[PDB]
């Protein structure tokens, strides 16, 4: 039970470490974590080239992320387990995660941008033009 919770600690730590590393800030365990982090870094440093976008290559549609994950991991351990494979396991998950957060960031930006830009045109562009446009805003500020 305790060992099962520590695994959760490892995964969360690896996924977090991978995310910030790619530019999204926000005996003992720490040895294991750093070791796992580094091993993952080496794995990615050696092999990342072969893959483009894992999501794209896997054809991940929303209702098939879990399946695709399980399918990949099951093939990865098809005929057994070694530490190399477990590293690739953590490494693979991290690439998925980073890839997902990236795509979703774009999605969220795309939406809110559309809400705001629609408002700007339907509600604010007339007033902007009545008052000298953006040039007069820039004069007022700076």
């Amino acid at each position: 039970s305790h060992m099962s919770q520590s695994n959760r600690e490892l995964v969360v730590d690896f996924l977090s470490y991978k995310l910030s590393q790619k530019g999204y800030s926000w005996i003992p365990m720490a040895a294991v974590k750093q070791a796992l982090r580094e091993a993952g870094d080496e794995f990615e440093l050696r092999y990342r080239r072969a893959f483009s976008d894992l999501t794209s290559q896997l054809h991940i549609t929303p209702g098939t992320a879990y399946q695709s994950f399980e399918q990949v991991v099951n093939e990865l351990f098809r005929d057994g387990v070694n530490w190399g494979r477990i590293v690739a396991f953590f490494s693979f998950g991290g690439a998925l995660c980073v890839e997902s957060v990236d795509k979703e960031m774009q999605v969220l930006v795309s939406r809110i941008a559309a809400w705001m830009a629609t408002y700007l045109n339907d509600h604010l562009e007339p007033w902007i033009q009545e008052n000298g446009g953006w040039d007069t805003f820039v004069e007022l500020y700076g």
Binding site: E42, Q67, Q71, L76, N82, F92
Partner: peptide
């Protein structure tokens, strides 16, 4: 078809190199 199998297989070969070197 079976992109997940294909890719998981690629990871497996890559994983096995890393393990051979430790």
């Amino acid at each position: 078809e079976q992109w997940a199998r294909e890719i998981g297989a690629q990871l497996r070969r890559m994983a096995d190199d890393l393990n051979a070197q430790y």
